[PDB]
Structure formats: C-alpha cells, structure tokens
C-alpha cells in the first residue's frame, strides 16, 4: 500500500432560505429498473454512491435512457431542482484565452483525467441533498436509496470544484516547472513546452509521478489528438492559429435566423479575416423578432456579402505571440461607421484582426469613432497580451492636435503614428473663436405651434437682408435648425450667426460631421463650404436686437 | 485581538464585481505583493465556494517607485452596514480647513494589525487575473482589516484614538482627522516646525508598533475660491455686450436682483457683431449695480450631511480646469480653478484624473466626504485610462456628461 494524499473537499452550501430537493421519483419500466440497479451496483462498488436508510427526506428523479438503439442502458440523474437550490460558485472558465496571445509550443501532450474526477469527494454534509431512488420491481419492495460521495455529473458545483481541485494539485508542479504550460479543458489536461521531445516526455512522466501522489493515473497511451486542435471554434496549430472553416451557405432566400447565423459567422471570422463587413447585413435585423420571416436583401447587403465571400475564399492564419518583439495595431476606416484593424509584430504577419462599429447615436464624427476604436483595441490588447500596442492611424498629427486642444471633452490616444493610407480621418469644419470683421451678421430664429405644427424660420442681418420661410409639420427645434441653415445658404464664405437656440448649439458644439437628421447634415455640408463661421449664442426674450422672435411669433 | 462582528445591509449580498484587465507589470507587482501578504497572514487563498469579487489594481503613490495594491471596495462599501460605532460619526472637524498647513499621511498599514470577523471575510474576495486567461486567477480574501474598506477606519478607531493621546494632549491645537487609510494633520506652525511635528508623530507611530514616511502637504488657508466677475472695458462691441448679457442672465439664476434691461437696450436694431457700442449712463449704472451684487455671497447656501456633494468639472483649455462643488443647483459650496502642470502637458485624461483627485482631497478636508463627479469625458475613454494616473487610496463616484454645457466660458 502506497499512501496517497487525500483531495481536500470543498464546503458546499444550499442557497440561504432554501432546503434540499424533494422531487417525486418517476414510474419506470421493469426493463429500466433492472438496468438502473445493475448500473448503480457497479457505481456503488466504485465508491461513487452509497446506499442510504429511510431517514433521508430528499429526492432527485432518476432516468434510464437507451444508448443509440443498442442493448445497453445509460442512467440520468436529473439535478435541475438541486441546481436551482445550490449556491453560486466561482466559475473559473469565464473568459477563454485568445490564440493570438499564446506562445508557440514545440510539443503539446494530451492527458485524460476522466478518472481523477472520481477521486474528488463531495462535501460530506452536502451528500444528503443528492439522494435518489430506484423504484422497485412492481413497487412491492421499498425503492433502493442512494446518495453521492463524488461530484455528480450534471450537478451545479461539479465543474468548478473539479477544476479548482485539479488546479490546487497541479500548482506546485507548474510553479517548479516554469518551462511548460498546463491547461485543463474538461476531461483533458494539455501539457505544452518548447522542449526537445525527450526532455518534454520526461516532464510528462514527471507529471504522472506527481499526480500519483493523489492516487491519480493518466492512462498513458496515445490519444487520438495530434495538432491541429479543434478548440472553442479555433484550430490550434504548432506555429499558427486560425478559426475553424467558415462556410457561408448559398441561398436564394434568407430568413431573420439565416442572417443572424450569417453575421455571427462573420463576426467570428473577423478576428482573423481582415476587412470583413457586417453593417448592411446587420441593419436588416433591425426590429423584427420573427425568426421565420423571410427578409429581402438590399442590393447594398448583397454587395457586402459578395465582398465577404471573396475574403473568405482564402484560408488565413494568425501567428502566435513573441514577447521579444513589438506590438503594433493599425486601423482603417471602412465607411458607414465601420472600422477594421490588424494587430501584428512583423509586417504582413497578423496576430489577429478585428472590427469596430459606430455606436447608437444622433450625431457623430470620424475622430470620435477612431478614438473609440483605439480604446476598444487598447482594452482587448491588454486582455490578450497585457500591454497597449503601438498604433498606426489614418489621421494627421496636426489634425489630432487641433481636435483634442479645441474639444470640450477630455480625450486621449496612446502612443501612435500617422499612416498615410486613404481614406484619411480629418476635421470637416472649424468654427471661429471671435466675431469676424467685415462678415455679414445674421440674426436667426425659428418657432412652431405645438398644436398646428405650423412654424417659421428665418433671419435678419446688419445689411438689411431678411428672410422668413413658412413651414409645416415642424417643431421649435427643427425651426431653430432651419433658421441657421437658411443663414448659411444665403451668406458669403464668411458669416457671423446669432442664435438663441441652446439646442442647436448643443449639437454644433459637439462638432458632428454626420447625423441622423438630414437637416443637421445639410447644415454640416454648408459649414464645410464656408471659409469662416462664427456662431454666437444669446438668451431668448431679453430684448436683444436682431434676435427677431417677432417675424416668427406670427 | 478580538474581531468586532460585521454584517452587510438587509437583503443585500456581497459584491460580485468584475475584475477589469490589468497590464503585465501591474499583475507582476500584485503577485509579489500578495505573495508576501499571504506569508504575513493578512490574506488567504480561497476556494470556488466563494463567488464574491471586488476589483483590484496597482498604483504608484505621489513621488515613489514602489507599487501599492489598491482594492476598489466601492461596491462593498455601499453594501456594508451603516457603521455606527462609538464615534456615532465624529462630527467633521470644521477647523481643519482653516489650518495654515495640513499634512496627509498613509496609515493604512496599521489596519493589518487588526483581525477581521471570520464570517465577513468572504466578502473581501478579490482576484489577481492572468494575462489572456491563460492560468486560473489567484483568488484571495482578507484575514485582517483591508485598506480602502469603509469599515477599517471605523473599527480601528478605538485603537487609533489611544495611539494618538500622548501626541494630542501634548499638542492641543493641532487638528487630526482620519479618512479611510489617510490621516489629515493640520497646524498653524512654520513648515519646518510643522514638518517636525509630523515626524514627532510618525516615529510616534513606529513606536506604537506602526509608506507612512510619505507626506502630502496642503494649504487650506490659501485655497482657490471664485467670485463671478464681469469684464471692465473702455470699448464694448455688440458681441461683448451680447456675451455679458448671456453671462448676467445665467448669474441671475444664482443672484436675485441681476438686471439686463439697460444693457439689452444697447442691442436694438440689427447691428454688426464687431460694431462698438458706447455705454449709456443707465447701462453703466446697471452694470455697476450687478457688479456690486456679485460681491455679496449667494443667498441660502448651507451644507447638508444627509445629501451627496456634487462636483462638476469643465475643460477650459491650455491645461486649465474649472470646477464647482454643490448639493443644490446654483448653490455652490465651493468653486475653484486648476492649471497644474503635473506631467500631463499632452494628456487631457491625466490632467482630469489629477483634477479629480485634488477636488476629492479638498472635499474630504472641508466636509469629510467625497463628492460625486460629473466628468466631461466619454465613459469608454475614462474607464480605459484613469487607473494609469491614479495615486490616491480612495476612489470617488463619477458619472459622464456627453452634452457640452453652455456655461463653460462663464466660469472662465
Ligand atoms: C498546438 O496547439 C497549441 C496549444 C497551445 C499553445 N500555447 C500555449 N498554451 C497554453 N495553454 C493551452 C494549452 C497548453 C493547450 C490548449 C489546447 C486545448 C485544446 N484543444 C489551450 C491552451 C490555452 N498556455 C500558454 N502560455 C503561453 N503559450 C501557451 C501552442 C500551441
């Protein structure tokens, strides 16, 4: 007898206020009962379950399910009720590694730890809650009562307790062998190194020697698992990684569901396939819910899809991470609020790619979007490599400086360099800080009637120029914007504009270059055409001259 | 040696706050810090039966090179029971803000000498994350009073109060205030005398068994205040007068008898913005009347400890920032202005992060609590960067303003 260390048990509790499950056992067939008894007898022989007395008032329904039309039955204990009543755990699976963060591994060994699982004992005081009953033949005897001694498959705490028990055991091995990596995925232990295969196989036998101390064996044969690994949607190769094959279906008709599947596939592909676009395909799912509803494709969406097919024509691979080299992120503007990016260390050798979509909003500008893309990539990079990459941005240094020095908000972009690849991000207009001498002064105003929706917009100027336009189906805000629009339309390349609209100023001070409102967009197009625009604000109804509510009052 | 029992608030569970991404160098710093803390028994490893979490990160304090562990206990703090003690709340020392000099000490390490109630320890769970989720996050909980936790100074109070007695009774005019891991010590001495008294207080803690060597010095007596001012000109343009009226209209929300009628009358007709308008006598007098009004303080301004303090900040450009602290709109308790060049000439966010810390410090000295900030910045930008520039052991609350306020230049 070689003494083995016991695996320390995790103290498990029910959610407060809750008692254990009391779920009635289902009536079964004599055929299934015999099968279940045989199974539960083997398990009891293995120490997984123990027969219990009649004191235990807890129950969880057990089932018998025919394995693939064979002559063999499998058992299913349904722990859904107990899982509802079982405490939350620290789940450690939250967040999977991204392959682009991994280092290349010469050798990667797979060990099966399916058996180690049953050396993890269930907390003694919790076992009672796992009670189940095999009904007896013809209900003429008391059902056989069992409870668990090991983590039941299907039980809420099993994956977290198994994982954390394995980790605690592996910990000193990992710490004292810093030239290997160990990663657990379900019933498999992946052990990788950059070692000579002799030195690597040594470490493996050493790991087995270490696990033996807890009575744990790792079959020791040859798994049907050599690179590439199919894992979480990826292909892990020795020196490269990529996503599993992306196959876009041929269809003459797409439903809501088909498009969701399509975007989902494209979103997944975008992490390594550069330039993938999804706006025109996503902007079809806007307000629906009927998954069966056959949505027609816009000509704009069929063009996006065809472009994607071309991109998906060639298999693309990302390289693994080299901490010795630098980390570089490059962004391009795609149009329609879409941005695409590549992260690399060596030119033409991407670690990964990605995209960013413009947020939900009324007005926006390219600089703001670029800033958001930067922030997103920064955060993702810190997740994946623990550092911020150096940026290559399609924006001039002078443009950025002008932007952030004059912008009302605080903003920041980490270390970056201009990359001259069109389309370049720029500022489309710049308002004056002081009134312009020699420029005509336009006093603008608008007003509308809440009931009739009838409104007026217009201006009066220092040279006696005047306009009032009557408007239908409008609001005060629309008339205030319209008034400013007219002033821009009817002025020279340099103009001073005086308004009392806090609304219009809130928008324009936000410096948008694009908007949902076509009215704001026309205003933007006018500003772009001007050489100089000074916008001044004044309080309404204070008897400020020019400020002519009167031409609008009517 | 005996743990005072602590509970959460009724119907409240512990914090389950996401750990945010950390750079490699902060992760390394924390691994080293927590490794030694675990040796010292201040923290212990925890199992998967603890589902709680509080974010953690690393900082460098003002003018040192050594990393400091900072835990964001904001959630735990608002979920931990209203800590009435035997202080019942020491009514905030109003004399602190009048002292000629105040020195700030980091006394948080004293907390580690007092054990934490066993049944509450679970709620102090935190995670040191791995890069790219490649290894399991290292999970810990506290065995002692943790720094940054509201209950720590509350509980340690009776211990602190008797450590201080020899020094306090010796120096009856020196005001000493505790907020979180910080000790605020203010006197009206000479800097060299003041500095010695602080040293006659630090060794005096090292003697009582307890980076306390660091010293952050403030001068409340000479702190920034801001009356409203109007321009003094010999020639007024239409634009100048329009801007003045806008400012007075705004000030009339704060000050009752502000008048703009005579000043508006100068703007009748539709004049060029750059045209000079001579002031009438009725206009100059009205301007003079308003100017006198803006000398008197605001009517009905009181502090209410039951209410939150609100801090707004505006970016004025050229490294300049204005701020106002209030509880009620147009009832400012404090206004100020910053221009400090603290290694952020080219970094807006760094400047803002520092402005935020300075305003919080002022607010602690004056009222004994931190204000809720309204920050002129996008959330995603602020969330990405502020931890890189953070040097305090407390963290205030903040919200984000996305619409440019008109009132910006009225504070410049
Ligand atoms: C050939 O496949 C691989 C797998 C992993 C790496 N590199 C690294 N892996 C890990 N952990 C890890 C391991 C060892 C295997 C898998 C595959 C599971 C399946 N199927 C997944 C992971 C995350 N950690 C590393 N740290 C640096 N390089 C690493 C390199 C090539």
List keywords for this structure.
heterodimer; A: 554 residues; alpha+beta; HIV Type 1 Reverse Transcriptase, Chain A, domain 1; Alpha-Beta Plaits; 5 domains; five-stranded mixed sheet; 13 helices; 24 strands; 28% helix; 22% strand; B: 412 residues; four-stranded antiparallel sheet; 9 helices; 16 strands; 19% strand; elongated; binds the ligand COc1ccc(Nc2nc(Nc3c(C)cc(/C=C/C#N)cc3C)nc3nc[nH]c23)cc1; p51 RT (chain B); hydrolase, transferase/inhibitor
What does this structure look like?
- The complex is a heterodimer of chains A (554) and B (412).
- In chain A, helix 10 (476-489) runs parallel beside helix 12 (518-529).
- In chain A, strand 10 (234-236) and strand 11 (240-243) form a beta hairpin.
- In chain A, the strands form 7 sheets. A 5-stranded mixed sheet of chain A has the order 15-14-13-17-18.
- Helix content of chain A is 28%, strand content 22%.
- Chain A contains 13 helices and 24 strands.
- Chain B folds into 4 domains: 5-94 and 120-160, HIV Type 1 Reverse Transcriptase, Chain A, domain 1, CATH 3.10.10.10; 95-119 and 161-217, 2-Layer Sandwich (Alpha-Beta Plaits); 218-303, Reverse transcriptase/Diguanylate cyclase domain (Alpha-Beta Plaits); 304-412, 2-Layer Sandwich (Alpha-Beta Plaits), CATH 3.30.70.
- The longest helix of chain B has 20 residues, at 151-170.
- Chain B is elongated and about 80 Å long.
- The interface between A and B is large, with 76 and 63 residues.
- The structure holds ligand G73.
- The site of ligand G73 has 17 residues of chain A, from strand 7, strand 8 and strand 9.
- Chain B: Residues 211-219 are annotated as: RT 'primer grip'.
- Chain B: It comes from Human immunodeficiency virus type 1 group M subtype B (isolate BH10).
């Amino acid at each position: 007898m070689v003494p083995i260390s016991p695996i320390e048990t995790v103290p498990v509790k029910l959610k407060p206020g809750m008692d254990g499950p009391k779920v009635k056992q289902w009536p079964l067939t004599e055929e299934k009962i015999k099968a279940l008894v045989e199974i539960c007898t083997e398990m009891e022989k293995e120490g997984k379950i123990s027969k219990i007395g009649p004191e235990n008032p807890y129950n969880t329904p057990v089932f018998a399910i025919k394995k693939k039309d064979s002559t063999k039955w499998r058992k299913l204990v349904d722990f859904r009720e107990l899982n509802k009543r079982t405490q939350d755990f620290w789940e450690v699976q939250l967040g999977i590694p991204h392959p682009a963060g991994l280092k290349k591994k010469k050798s990667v060994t797979v060990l099966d730890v399916g058996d180690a699982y049953f050396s993890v004992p269930l907390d003694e005081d919790f076992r009672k809650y796992t009670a189940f009953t095999i009904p007896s033949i013809n209900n003429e005897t008391p059902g056989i009562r069992y409870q668990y001694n090991v983590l039941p498959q299907g039980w809420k705490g099993s994956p977290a307790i198994f994982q954390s028990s394995m980790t605690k055991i592996l910990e000193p091995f990992a710490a004292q062998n810093p030239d290997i990596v160990i990663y657990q995925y379900m019933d498999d232990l992946y052990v990788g190194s950059d070692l000579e295969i002799g030195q690597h196989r040594t470490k493996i036998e050493e790991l087995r020697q270490h696990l033996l101390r807890w009575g744990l064996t790792t079959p020791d044969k040859k798994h049907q698992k050599e690179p590439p690994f199919l894992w979480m949607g990826y292909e892990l190769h020795p020196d490269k990684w990529t996503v599993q094959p992306i196959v876009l279906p041929e269809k003459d008709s797409w439903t809501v569901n088909d498009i969701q599947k399509l975007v989902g596939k494209l979103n997944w592909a975008s992490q390594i396939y550069p330039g993938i676009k999804v706006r025109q395909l996503s902007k079809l799912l806007r307000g629906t819910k009927a998954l069966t509803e056959v949505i027609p494709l816009t000509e704009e969406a069929e063009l996006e899809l065809a472009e994607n097919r071309e991109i998906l024509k060639e298999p693309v691979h990302g390289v693994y991470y080299d901490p010795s080299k630098d980390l570089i992120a490059e962004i391009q503007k795609q149009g329609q609020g879409q941005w695409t990016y590549q992260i690399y260390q060596e030119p033409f050798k991407n670690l990964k790619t990605g995209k960013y979509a413009r947020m939900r909003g009324a007005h926006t500008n390219d600089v703001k979007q670029l800033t958001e893309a930067v922030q997103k990539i920064t955060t993702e990079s810190i997740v994946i490599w623990g550092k911020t990459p150096k940026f290559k941005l399609p924006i001039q240094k002078e443009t950025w400086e002008t932007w952030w020095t004059e912008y009302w908000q605080a903003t920041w972009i980490p270390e970056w360099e201009f990359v001259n690849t069109p389309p370049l991000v720029k500022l489309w207009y710049q308002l004056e800080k002081e009134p312009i001498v020699g420029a005509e002064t336009f006093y603008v105003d608008g007003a509308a009637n809440r009931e009739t929706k009838l409104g007026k917009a217009g201006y009066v100027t220092n040279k006696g120029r005047q306009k009032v336009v009557p408007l239908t189906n409008t609001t005060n805000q629309k008339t205030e914007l319209q008034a400013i629009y007219l002033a821009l339309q009817d002025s020279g390349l340099e103009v001073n504009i005086v308004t009392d609209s806090q609304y219009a100023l809130g928008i324009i001070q936000a410096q948008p270059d694009k908007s949902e409102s076509e009215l704001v967009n026309q205003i933007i197009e006018q500003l772009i055409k001007k050489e100089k625009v000074y916008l001044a604000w004044v309080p309404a109804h204070k008897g400020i001259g020019g400020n002519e509510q009167v031409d609008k009052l009517v | 040696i005996e743990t005072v029992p602590v509970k959460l608030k009724p119907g409240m569970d512990g914090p389950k706050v996401k750990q945010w991404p950390l750079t490699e160098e902060k992760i390394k710093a924390l691994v080293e810090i927590c490794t030694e803390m675990e040796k010292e028994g201040k923290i212990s490893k925890i199992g998967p039966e603890n589902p709680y979490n509080t974010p953690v990160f690393a900082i460098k304090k003002k003018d040192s090179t050594k990393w400091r562990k900072l835990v964001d206990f904001r959630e735990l703090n608002k979920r931990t029971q209203d800590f009435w003690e035997v202080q019942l709340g020491i009514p905030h020392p109003a004399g602190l803000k009048k002292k000629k000099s105040v020195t700030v000490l980091d006394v948080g390490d004293a907390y580690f000498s007092v054990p934490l109630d066993e049944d509450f320890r679970k709620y102090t769970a935190f995670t040191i994350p791995s890069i790219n989720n490649e290894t399991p996050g290292i999970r810990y909980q506290y065995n002692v009073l943790p720094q940054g936790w509201k209950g720590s100074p509350a509980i340690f109070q009776s211990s602190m109060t008797k450590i201080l007695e020899p020094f306090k009774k010796q120096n009856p005019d020196i005001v000493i205030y505790q907020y979180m891991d910080d000790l605020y010590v203010g006197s009206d001495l000479e800097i060299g005398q003041h500095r010695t008294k602080i040293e006659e207080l630090r060794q005096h803690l090292l003697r009582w068994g307890l980076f306390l060597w660091m010293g952050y010095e403030l001068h409340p007596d000479k702190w920034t205040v801001q009356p409203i001012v109007l321009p003094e000109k010999d020639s007024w343009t239409v634009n100048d007068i329009q801007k003045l009226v806008g400012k007075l209209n705004w000030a009339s929300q704060i000050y009752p008898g502000i008048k703009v009628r005579q000043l508006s009358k100068l703007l009748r007709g539709t004049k060029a913005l750059t045209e000079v308008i001579p002031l009438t006598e009725e206009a100059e007098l009205e301007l003079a009347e308003n100017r006198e009004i803006l000398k008197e303080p605001v009517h009905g301004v009181y502090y209410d400890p039951s209410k939150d303090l609100i801090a707004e900040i505006q970016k004025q450009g050229q490294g300049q920032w204005t701020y106002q602290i209030y509880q009620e709109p147009f009832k400012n308790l404090k206004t100020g202005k910053y221009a400090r060049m603290r290694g952020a000439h080219t970094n807006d966010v760094k400047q803002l992060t520092e402005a935020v810390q300075k305003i919080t410090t002022e607010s602690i000295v004056i009222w004994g609590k931190t204000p809720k900030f309204k920050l002129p910045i996008q959330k995603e930008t602020w969330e990405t960067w502020w931890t890189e520039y953070w040097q305090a052991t407390w963290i205030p609350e903040w919200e984000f303003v996305n619409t440019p306020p008109l009132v910006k230049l009225w504070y410049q």
